[PDB]
A and B are shown apart, each in its own frame.
Chain A
Amino acid sequence: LEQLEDRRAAARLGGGQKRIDAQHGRGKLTARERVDLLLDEGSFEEFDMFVTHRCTDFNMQDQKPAGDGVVTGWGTINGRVVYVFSQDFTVLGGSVSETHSKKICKIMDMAMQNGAPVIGINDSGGARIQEGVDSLAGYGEVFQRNIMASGVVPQISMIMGPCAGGAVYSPAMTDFIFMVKDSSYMFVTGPDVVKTVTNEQVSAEELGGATTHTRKSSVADAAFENDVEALAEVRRLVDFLPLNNREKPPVRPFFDDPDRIEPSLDTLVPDNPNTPYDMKELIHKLADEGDFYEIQEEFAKNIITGFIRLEGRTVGVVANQPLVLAGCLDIDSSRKAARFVRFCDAFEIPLLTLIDVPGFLPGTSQEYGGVIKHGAKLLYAYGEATVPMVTVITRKAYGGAYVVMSSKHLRADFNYAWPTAEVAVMGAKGATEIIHRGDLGDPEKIAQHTADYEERFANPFVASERGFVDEVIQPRSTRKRVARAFASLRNKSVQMPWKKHDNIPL
């Protein structure tokens, strides 16, 4: 029946050609257009296209659009199956109803039964008020699903419009949150209530805009320039991820050599210890085709988390940034890396940790802020992780931080060190003042006591005599050392004690 074709095409129109323009007006693509660019050209199969809500209050039953506000279904990304839902803002604001969620659950339930990621494209005005508790229940079934799938199948959230109220809590629980620079936002409570209750006046963009979230709240993993790159970068991300927790990181061709040498590296660590360098240089040189997909770049900049491949396989990476806060570990840097580590482990992605941390960032602000708990998270993450763990200390590895950064005591596999490494209880100075009290009144004793601690302990060799550093290597060969180190761990299998789940600090 060409009648079918009509119904079909009718549905495809969403809230109508006038609203479609409105949407495009805000620089925002439509639900379907976003889906169209996300999935392998012509590979999308839509489900529940003619679903209509079951509301009867407030004359809601006189406006029963097809699809009920969200476009769901599946398709492929580079040939690999992926499940998706794109909220159609032009339809009843892409407001969440009993049936809108049901649609999302159908493909979440399908993603899980078949072991395939779920990409969520949120662009909604929020709950569908007229539905009452049914809107609440609608959220509930999504949340529950979101939770059960955590670490079982990758859940990438894409915010491309508004996201308010309970809603935020869903992407909150997914593995990644990407936002579109200016057209998107998200917050539990609206700017207007923030006023009537805080008397504070703030705009939606200020309150929960892409920027606010990619660098202040710690909620988004990146803010993309616009809808098109947003979609493009997400597939890029998906190309690294495994399809579920059973299989291991995907493999693909790679035009680079596992034995590549970067001599430039031999001088990356500056002579003067007070001069930074960009830890990211190292990352790119080690990374396969120099490709490095960074996560939460604009947040907790004193630490770097990202993905790279080696010999065409996915490797996660956590590394300290001297350029910021002197590579200190702090509540935020900790929370930022901690989760990255956990996601990579939950999904069999190995870890490469590049080290140069002085210690943790001092301060009343830190202590009152609970570094005792947040700081531990990253420690907890490496302690728990069982994927293959290779480490390279480029320079500073002092005290507690030293331990947290994938130390050998956290049962990492390879603990490499550049000759410029310095692993020790604390700096030569402080160390000395504690070890030699009755000697401070002799500024030449302590000037000499330090000079000895420095000459005897600030290096990687005392740690080597102990076995804590499996080897000290020539910087230029890092790429070669690390590549085969992982290669040899492809079979690694380690068992953690049985338990329903962990109790990591929150």
Chain B
Amino acid sequence: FNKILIANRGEIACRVIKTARKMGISTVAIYSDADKQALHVQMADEAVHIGPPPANQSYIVIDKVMAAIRATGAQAVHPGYGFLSENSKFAEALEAEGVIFVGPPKGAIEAMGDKITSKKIAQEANVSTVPGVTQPRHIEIQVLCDSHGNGIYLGERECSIQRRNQKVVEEAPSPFLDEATRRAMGEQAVALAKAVGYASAGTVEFIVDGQKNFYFLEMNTRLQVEHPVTELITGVDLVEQMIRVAAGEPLSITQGDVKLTGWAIENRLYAEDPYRGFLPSIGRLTRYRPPAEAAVRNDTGVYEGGEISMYYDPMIAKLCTWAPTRAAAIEAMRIALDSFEVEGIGHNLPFLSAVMDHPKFISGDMTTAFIAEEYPEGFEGVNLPETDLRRVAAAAAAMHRVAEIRRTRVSGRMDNHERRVGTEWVVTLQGADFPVTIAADHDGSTVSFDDGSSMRVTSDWTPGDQLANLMVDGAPLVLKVGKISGGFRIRTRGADLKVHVRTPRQAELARLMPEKLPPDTSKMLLCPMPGLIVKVDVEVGQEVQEGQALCTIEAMKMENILRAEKKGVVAKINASAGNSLAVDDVIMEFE
């Protein structure tokens, strides 16, 4: 146990590194070019380049890796996942050195690597299988062995809620299957384990149905991205045990010991824009502010000031929470998200918030088509219910006054004739008006609405804070604030609306203001700068999101990215790399 390299990067790299060094173990890492910044680099006690940004030239190249594994002296390399975590060539080259590839044996890996083979290996293994399903629920089991015959499972995680097959939300345990059927899946899971000679930790994916009838789709010989959930109820560090065993070792705990306490939910913060058909997002992270602690865990491979390059997975973070009861964890999460601040890229934060509030997620009655059933038209935005608009109205109204009073303390005002801040306002939310009166002293503020009702706003907030932690009617309300002519842009749950806080006459007149209609768009992308086309990243008949990078013209040794005006589909292109066009020259055409 000492100098152990990592064949991966991103959040996972940190994930392992944070464990290695927590057990006094010489950490080491690798990194491409567009990754000298990366948080894992700086987390390790060493680091070695490995070539250009693409991994098919840096992170996958076994020569590169190896050269460094010795270059820094191995002892136990870890692949994290989705890279060489399951590529035999590298699995053998390590043994051809003595570098303990912490994980599964290159055999069992190729075993469950092929469907057919796997099918059989479970059969005699007496592993349930779709003979030859009602409410399909993707429910998996986390098992861990060692090369010493022992092996046990540590509960199950339900990842039913996934879009286009890409997992979105994982939870542990599963709100469906009970104790018996759980051990059922569990006992049979681990049994299947040994049957193939699995060493480290691995996952067995089942397809439970409406009657708790479970089957078996397959086994992934590696560490699962969604493992955090398992860890927050089992009280184990799969990355820890993973090395322990990969280092000839027994299991400190037996099946009778492995207890599963309270609940855990894990969301994935993806740099994708829900509002524009989850188009990936590329760019630098201006604000990047997650929560911290009912627990709150954030596995990230990014930081503020960092950039999300086209050369990797759009995941930015895994926001996990846990608590005693499930309802609890879903709550810490809901709060958790509310405070997660991200700026500079398009992300699914609002979308996640949305499903966390989705009844079916709340009732647990979810299938594997949930995402497809409930969000058939992509993410249509979220909109608050009266008692929500109400609470928000009051808060904005309360904050607005605060700010307004400050404008009043300008130097140079008429001595006995300063501006006096009003008490009556009209908060205009989601197409809803809220005539409200404010009275505030020192503790907080008391907002009263037309119906005689009154809420009490209390807050730390002050102009400029981008996030506002208020206390309206004793209950916590976390908002993301931005300035706007007549009030602010507020964002709560999947919410994101212009909250106007005006005075009665201000409001009365604004009502006379015409309703703005966006400009018109040509279906022709004209070249605005007489330059040279560096690159076109769009194909004919491709569909583009409003604001999507189309091409890139080089101006005066400066690159300019041109982008779609409104969502649409490429009719024809008529210019390519190396081309040099003047102004107005049509670059592309849209149907």
Contact = CB atoms under 8 A, between A and B. Distances in A.
Interface string A343-365: 00000000000000010010000
A281 B286 contact: yes
A225 interface: yes
Given A252-B407, A267-B305, A275-B558, 16 more contacts: A29-B509, A41-B505, A76-B414, A79-B414, A79-B417, A250-B412, A252-B409, A253-B406, A255-B462, A263-B305, A273-B557, A274-B557, A276-B559, A281-B286, A291-B464, A358-B558
A376 interface: no
Contacts, number: 134
Contact of A328 (B462, B505, B516, B556): B556
A326 B485 contact: no
Given A232-B485, A267-B37, A322-B558, A252 B305 contact: no
A260 to B, nearest CB: 10
B410 interface: yes
B505 A358 contact: no
A366 interface: no
B393 to A, nearest CB: 19
Interface string A37-50: 10011010000000
A79 B514 contact: no
Contacts of A288: 464
A264 interface: yes
Contact of A76 (B285, B417, B514): B417
Nearest to A23: B512
Interface in B498-515: 503, 505-506, 509-510, 512-514
B87 interface: no
Contact of A239 (B37, B407, B422, B560): B407
B486 A274 contact: no
A79 B556 contact: no
Interface in A179-233: 181-182, 225-229, 232-233
29 contacts: A24-B512, A27-B514, A76-B417, A78-B408, A79-B419, A80-B414, A228-B485, A228-B486, A228-B506, A229-B485, A229-B486, A233-B485, A247-B412, A250-B412, A251-B410, A252-B409, A253-B409, A255-B465, A263-B305, A264-B304, A265-B305, A273-B557, A274-B558, A275-B558, A288-B464, A290-B464, A291-B464, A327-B558, A358-B558
A252 to B, nearest CB: 5
B410 A79 contact: yes
Contacts of A33: 509
Contacts of A358: 556-558
Contacts of B554: 274
Contacts of B413: 76, 78-80
Given A41-B503, A43-B419, A80-B412, A323 B560 contact: yes
Given A264-B286, A265-B305, A228 B559 contact: no
Interface in B146-160: none
B483 interface: yes
A226 B515 CA distance: 9
A325 B305 contact: no
B463 A289 contact: yes
A256 B465 CA distance: 9
Given A40-B419, A76-B413, A79-B410, A276 B558 contact: yes
A254 to B, nearest CB: 8
Interface string B512-547: 111010000000000001000000000000000000
